[PDB]
Design a protein around this ligand. Sequence first.
Ligand code: CLA
Ligand code: CLA
Ligand code: CLA
Ligand code: CLA
Ligand code: CLA
Ligand code: CLA
Ligand SMILES: CCCCCCCCCCCCCCCC(=O)OC[C@H](COP(=O)(O)OC[C@@H](O)CO)OC(=O)CCCCCCCCCCCCCCC
Ligand SMILES: CCCCCCCCCCCCCCCC(=O)OC[C@H](COP(=O)(O)OC[C@@H](O)CO)OC(=O)CCCCCCCCCCCCCCC
Ligand code: SF4
Ligand code: SF4
Ligand SMILES: [Ca+2]
Ligand SMILES: [Cl-]
Lengths: 40, 40, 31, 31, 146, 139, 80, 737, 154
Amino acid sequence: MDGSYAASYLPWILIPMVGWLFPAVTMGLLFIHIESEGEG
Amino acid sequence: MDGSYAASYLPWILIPMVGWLFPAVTMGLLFIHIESEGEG
Amino acid sequence: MALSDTQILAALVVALLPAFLAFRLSTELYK
Amino acid sequence: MALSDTQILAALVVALLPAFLAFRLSTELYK
Amino acid sequence: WLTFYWHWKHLGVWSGNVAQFNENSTYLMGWFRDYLWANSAQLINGYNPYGVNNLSVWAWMFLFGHLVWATGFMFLISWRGYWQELIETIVWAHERTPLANLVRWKDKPVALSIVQARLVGLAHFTVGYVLTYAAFLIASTAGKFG
Amino acid sequence: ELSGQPPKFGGSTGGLLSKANREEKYAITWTSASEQVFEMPTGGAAIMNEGENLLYLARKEQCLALGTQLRTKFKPKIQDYKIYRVYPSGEVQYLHPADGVFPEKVNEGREAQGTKTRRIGQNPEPVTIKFSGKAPYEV
Amino acid sequence: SHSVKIYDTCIGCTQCVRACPLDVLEMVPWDGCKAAQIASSPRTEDCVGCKRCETACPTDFLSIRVYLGAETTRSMGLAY
Amino acid sequence: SVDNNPVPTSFEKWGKPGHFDRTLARGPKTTTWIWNLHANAHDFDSQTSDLEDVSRKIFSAHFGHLAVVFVWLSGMYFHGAKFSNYEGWLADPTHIKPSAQVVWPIVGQGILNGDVGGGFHGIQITSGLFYLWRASGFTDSYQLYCTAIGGLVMAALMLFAGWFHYHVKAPKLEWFQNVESMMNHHLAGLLGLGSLGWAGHQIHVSMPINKLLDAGVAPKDIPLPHEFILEPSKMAELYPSFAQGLTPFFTLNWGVYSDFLTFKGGLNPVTGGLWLSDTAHHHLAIAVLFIIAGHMYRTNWGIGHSMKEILEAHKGPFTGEGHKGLYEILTTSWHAQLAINLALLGSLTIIVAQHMYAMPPYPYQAIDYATQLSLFTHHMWIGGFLIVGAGAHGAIFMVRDYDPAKNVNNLLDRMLRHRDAIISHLNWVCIFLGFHSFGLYIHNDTMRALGRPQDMFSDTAIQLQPIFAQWVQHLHTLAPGATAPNALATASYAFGGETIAVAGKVAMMPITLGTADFMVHHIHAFTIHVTALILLKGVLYARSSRLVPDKANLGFRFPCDGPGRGGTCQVSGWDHVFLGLFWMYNSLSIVIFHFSWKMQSDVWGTVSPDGSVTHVTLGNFAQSAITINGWLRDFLWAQAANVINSYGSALSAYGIMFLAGHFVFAFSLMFLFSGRGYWQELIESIVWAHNKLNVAPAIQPRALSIIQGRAVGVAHYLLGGIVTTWAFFLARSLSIG
Amino acid sequence: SNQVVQAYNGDPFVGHLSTPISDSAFTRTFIGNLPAYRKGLSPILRGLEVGMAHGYFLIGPWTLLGPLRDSEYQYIGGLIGALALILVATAALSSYGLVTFQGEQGSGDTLQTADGWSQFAAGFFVGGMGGAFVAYFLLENLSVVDGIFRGLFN
Ligand code: CLA
Ligand code: CLA
Ligand code: CLA
Ligand code: CLA
Ligand code: CLA
Ligand code: CLA
Ligand SMILES: CCCCCCCCCCCCCCCC(=O)OC[C@H](COP(=O)(O)OC[C@@H](O)CO)OC(=O)CCCCCCCCCCCCCCC
Ligand SMILES: CCCCCCCCCCCCCCCC(=O)OC[C@H](COP(=O)(O)OC[C@@H](O)CO)OC(=O)CCCCCCCCCCCCCCC
Ligand code: SF4
Ligand code: SF4
Ligand SMILES: [Ca+2]
Ligand SMILES: [Cl-]
């Protein structure tokens, strides 16, 4: 994969960030939140 | 070392298994057993 | 003509502002 | 002629059976 | 029905062969053959053993929509209590398996509710319906004309 | 404490899970004139002893299905079973029959709960009780 | 827990109490019917929501009504 | 012990429907009554509580069913003799296709009377009746007419026997419970003596006209089947072993008969059928083994076995009290016997389907690809339906006839005690199999769509070679001469050998097994395991579960125990049958699709005179059947062109049913996706409209019951899908050529 | 008697069976001496041993079947896949431990506390990436391991 557009390193870094880092972080935070036995 | 016989990778894996893995595992299990202060 | 690298990075720096504002609005809507 | 690789592996798969049976006999003789 | 009619009329109009619609839409075998079967040929050859073309994504999405529609058929046809009993056996299996008994669920696994079953099956049915027809529409029109 | 001999059983996979030692279990005690075979509500057959029998089950419904079997599937009808709820702290709460009389027969001292002095069709409209947190049947 | 309500068309046939598999209902003395008994639901925390009592009720537009509400371990019938 | 005139014969109770059910006999109040009536007709255990009268009803119903089957067979022989071209096909097999149905010219339907050969206009029959009739030695229309008349007479005899054994002279219960004699009478009787008589028929009648028709004799020049038995000189003219008579049979010298009783194997290379000498020797060996088997059990002379004692002796350290009690179950419960018989008969029909294609036993059946495909698919579907019925009647026995006091620590009680372990491990196996077969297909579709064919699962990529099946095929190929020394050829050429090339067409070749075969066989394993999981969970949890502990009190056939406990709809054994029906349907659709594609791709086709074979779909199965898209495009889309371009021709009826099944399946979804509360409220609105014009019926209309809605849905689903696949398969295989 | 199938821990009403798979002497002495159950172990040692075994075997599937298997960086791709999977597994383990042991801490197993499960997750991380790198270092210099096992250098 490559790109002739400006800042072609940005899909290179952001496709794993939006595909792996963002959903793993979001589901981890949501899993910790929806099982929180804090008050109710 | 090599072999013209069938499955010549088997001495390659089994000489360290019978020389190292089997006696170390056997003496470890036997050392744990003969020092067991369980009942008598 | 095509855009520049600095244009794209400046747009992402700009997009940091509605990200923070959406965080604030979702936090305020949560309570 | 010489034996095959599959012959040797089948013999080892067969030898798994007296291994289990010797484990059973030694365990039963221990008690 | 309306999108099938609109697309078959526009395929007849755009290609100039309106006679296919004018002599074959009056019976349903014409709809089956001259619209559904004929216009899938470029779509399902988006990928084949000989290679791919630009319609590969539409063939994959066509199959994906078929799969999601049929997955909705599960929740639509089979109902809750069978699944609740099956999940009870799976719960038993987890509670008796060593090195996995160290792991416990925080919420008790149950089957989906009856309304949830209907909603989930309908959602899959609708997603599959939409994706299947969108893949067929885009691939047939972009292969014949685009 | 709860007394009775456990019915002789080979064991089954349908019995108590970790909920029994974690949240609650249930117990059913009954006196038997003879030694005969009953059906476990968790699948299979067990043999109940002569005299007192104490059985531990996962749900109240399993104990009550066993009690229905005891009242209906034996020629001398076992009509004296007691069903209890057992907590992991050790406290045993008596459940059934609560007043000593089976609930299909009336008894004095039973208070009417869940009884409505209006008919089914004279429940008020939901629009009259909006933003109150209570249903038409709760008012 | 689910809510079990008994309305004043009850004629004290005790069929809802006999049909209930979880001992939710009793029959208490009453005066509104010739049988002089009305069904009651003191043990709705054990109710699972099976509506067998509704099926057993012979009055047209049943005098017993089960409303599924808050779901518990007892109400979902969980042995685990 | 036979009763004398138990039930009188009167015409009065025919006119009052619902006599058999006590609730039905009050009269109709709702329409459900009518729907209850047909639903309650054959449930004999529910109408009467005594086992004796239930057995009487079953015996008379069995005679009625045999009468129905005889009427069907008589109609088949009548349609093969008057309205057929068996004359004309028999002199010229490979120019004329079989056709045994003639359709009147009305409303334009005479187009279906297609040109099949020899100036005939009729529907090309694909059941294979002509090939079996040739294999039996039939040569004239008058003998087929005689067989039809004899079938009508036997149907009348079956009807009279049913009337006699229900109304006049009817047996007692211990006649039925004497199963020790019944098994001897069925093994040494029905099967053994029937196969001995058919071996005698083979050797005397079916072999001569078959071998003369294979030699080249015209069918009119073969005189008639009886004149062989009139003069034994014709056998010694043709099979020269018929010179010593019956002397080598009784004097341990059976090698004299090694001229009409052989061990060749393979196929006859004039017809493509099995060798008739091989089948006669097989039938004789089967007869002798079955006579030997039918002297196992004690009947009336104190010699034999007790099945109870054999069962009670089988117990081990793992299984407690073992097989204690199973004799009492299988002698008191009709449903338990029906379950195990349906399982074994469905497995047998599937075994018949799998054995018949690879060893074609009828002349010119193998080169008729339509007949081969039709017979395989029909017998597959029959077997799958019977296995579902087996699961059904196992659950019915569990609800009705099971007794826990009389099964303590035997096998069945221990099944019920570890059903959680059984079902959970079967669940894990089903998930594992679904992943590691269908996800392999999904992987392949994705890697082909992404332009990565070197990453697929295929023979030209990551290989999944079925090496055990290949090794067994190799062992079958080296069987005849090393491990089967007296066998001349292999058992079937599908295992390995050479291609039989009867006429210009193929009959059998080595069916090679590669990655696609591995994938589709594990798909079969997966789907069979899921159908088994559904039916076995329905059997093992028919009485109770952790969800509903009193399920046996609710019965076998009930919709639910209410919306509570989260929701308990489809907990009954009947609903497990309902779900297993769809899963068996899915399993068998994939099995017959695998069969059709592999036979058209790697077996069937046209043989060149040089020895090369051009296949029907040119070997595309190795590269296209590894993806779902390949199954969609190269199998479904490509081969449906025959069924959709059939309009205006004789195959157009196959077009119409191709539409028609598509209707019924979709119609089924109305019943499958909806619930009866909506339909009842809609019916209330239509009754109000009928109240306005005073057309309200006295029998009040209701919506269908929940169980009946599910039953209508599954029936219409299976009917529409099976009719669609039937139309597609037949219009493809009547156009393969 | 001779019956090898008994009630689980002598209670026939607990939903389990004493089987030669579930409750044989070999089963108890093997499972109870696995690191997750071995008596006296600190939870970091349990996690360390579990991680070493798991990270060592997780090298293999992407090494032999992954998309880099036909390139010159086959062992590299196997290692990166194993490291990323061990990272996801460690995140899942630590999130499970944070969720499960929110409230009171038991006085029984040290493993089944928030402190012990965090120690176990730390050990699992260290062992997983250690086992993955030691299996990669064996596979990348597999020629040297082969020459060592055949005495080619000596
Ligand atoms: C909502 C509109 C929208 C959509 C559908 C997409 C879609 C996409 N973007 Mg994109 N983008 C957007 C807005 C959007 N963008 C905006 C406003 C900017 C800033 C000017 C960017 C800057 C951007 C860059 C720099 C890159 C992409 C890329 C991509 C592709 C991969 C995803 C990714 O890495 O995102 C990364 C996106 C960002 C880092 C910017 C955040 C995007 C906006 C500001 C957030 C919107 C949130 C949304 C509206 C909230 C509701 C969501 C809903 C689920 C509830 C994908 C086609 C990649 C690409 O080209 O692949 C080929 C890539 O490198 N985008
Ligand atoms: C007791 C007889 C016996 C003896 C003395 C040996 C000796 C040897 N074998 Mg051997 N082997 C045997 C039986 C035996 N084998 C059998 C029956 C098989 C299966 C068909 C094999 C299969 C086998 C393979 C595949 C290989 C060897 C190899 C070797 C050599 C190295 C040791 C090793 O790696 O073992 C490995 C052995 C096994 C994995 C198989 C287990 C051996 C048997 C079944 C166990 C016998 C246990 C014993 C009788 C118990 C009493 C022992 C006593 C101390 C109390 C060594 C010369 C290696 C070699 O060729 O090196 C050049 C090698 O690669 N063997
Ligand atoms: C009968 C069995 C046996 C075998 C097969 C060997 C084999 C070997 N010995 Mg040896 N030795 C033995 C008995 C044996 N010895 C005995 C009984 C004695 C004396 C009492 C000696 C004394 C001896 C000396 C004094 C020396 C050797 C050395 C060596 C090695 C020379 C090559 C080298 O550098 O290895 C390098 C490889 C290793 C040391 C082991 C490699 C094992 C793997 C690759 C590493 C671990 C992998 C992983 C983390 C664990 C896997 C987990 C799971 C899959 C099992 C060679 C492998 C020399 C040596 O060790 O050199 C370093 C050396 O100096 N030997
Ligand atoms: C040896 C075979 C055999 C036998 C003896 C029985 C016997 C019995 N079964 Mg059974 N069953 C069988 C095979 C068999 N079945 C198979 C193969 C299946 C799987 C599909 C089932 C599934 C099954 C269920 C699910 C149930 C039974 C029930 C019953 C009992 C009453 C039957 C009844 O209601 O009749 C009346 C039958 C009907 C009203 C059905 C007629 C409608 C069918 C579906 C039409 C089929 C379409 C037709 C082929 C083509 C339509 C043409 C049209 C377009 C013109 C009785 C004990 C029932 C019972 O009460 O259990 C005790 C019950 O609930 N069975
Ligand atoms: C095509 C539609 C479809 C599909 C996919 C399924 C799938 C399944 N059914 Mg099913 N079912 C269907 C239609 C379908 N059904 C219909 C119409 C009915 C009505 C009669 C039923 C009735 C039914 C019953 C009654 C039973 C099942 C069972 C099963 C399971 C079998 C075990 C298995 O294969 O696990 C493996 C799972 C699959 C093969 C599904 C596909 C997985 C894909 C290939 C992998 C996806 C990768 C990844 C996860 C994607 C994530 C994306 C990311 C962004 C998150 C499985 C979940 C049985 C069961 O639970 O047994 C264990 C069972 O008892 N079903
Ligand atoms: C800016 C703050 C920050 C940073 C740099 C890190 C960095 C790290 N965390 Mg972490 N974490 C954070 C905040 C942070 N965390 C918070 C606030 C929580 C509480 C929810 C966690 C909970 C958490 C767990 C439960 C685990 C880690 C782990 C890790 C390491 C693995 C790499 C990783 O997660 O992706 C790099 C991360 C970032 C670029 C940003 C992370 C910031 C968000 C808030 C983390 C969300 C939590 C999520 C469940 C963990 C991510 C998993 C990963 C697969 C994406 C890494 C050193 C794992 C490990 O190995 O620890 C020993 C592990 O098991 N973290
Ligand atoms: C495809 C072929 C190549 C792969 C074969 C793989 C075999 C799979 C593993 C072996 C299964 C062993 C069961 C027999 C061994 C067996 O019969 O043991 C014998 C034992 C009965 O012992 P007793 O001495 O008590 O028996 C006396 C008997 O007469 C009954 O009273 O049965 C049990 O313990 C039941 C538990 C079976 C638990 C295993 C469940 C089987 C699930 C797997 C089924 C897979 C079949 C796969 C092949 C079709
Ligand atoms: C491939 C072709 C299609 C085959 C698909 C079939 C799937 C198998 C479905 C079997 C379930 C039924 C077994 C009884 C289970 C059961 O009873 O069914 C369910 C339903 C009634 O069940 P309920 O639970 O409502 O019954 C309550 C009663 O139990 C108490 O009164 O019965 C019917 O649907 C009656 C309607 C029959 C319609 C009568 C129409 C006349 C058709 C007769 C012609 C038949 C073919 C004759 C030969 C040509
Ligand atoms: S819904 Fe079921 S459990 Fe609840 S009161 Fe009615 S019968 Fe009893
Ligand atoms: S949806 Fe229908 S089948 Fe399911 S619980 Fe409710 S009434 Fe019963
Ligand atoms: Ca690659
Ligand atoms: Cl493809």
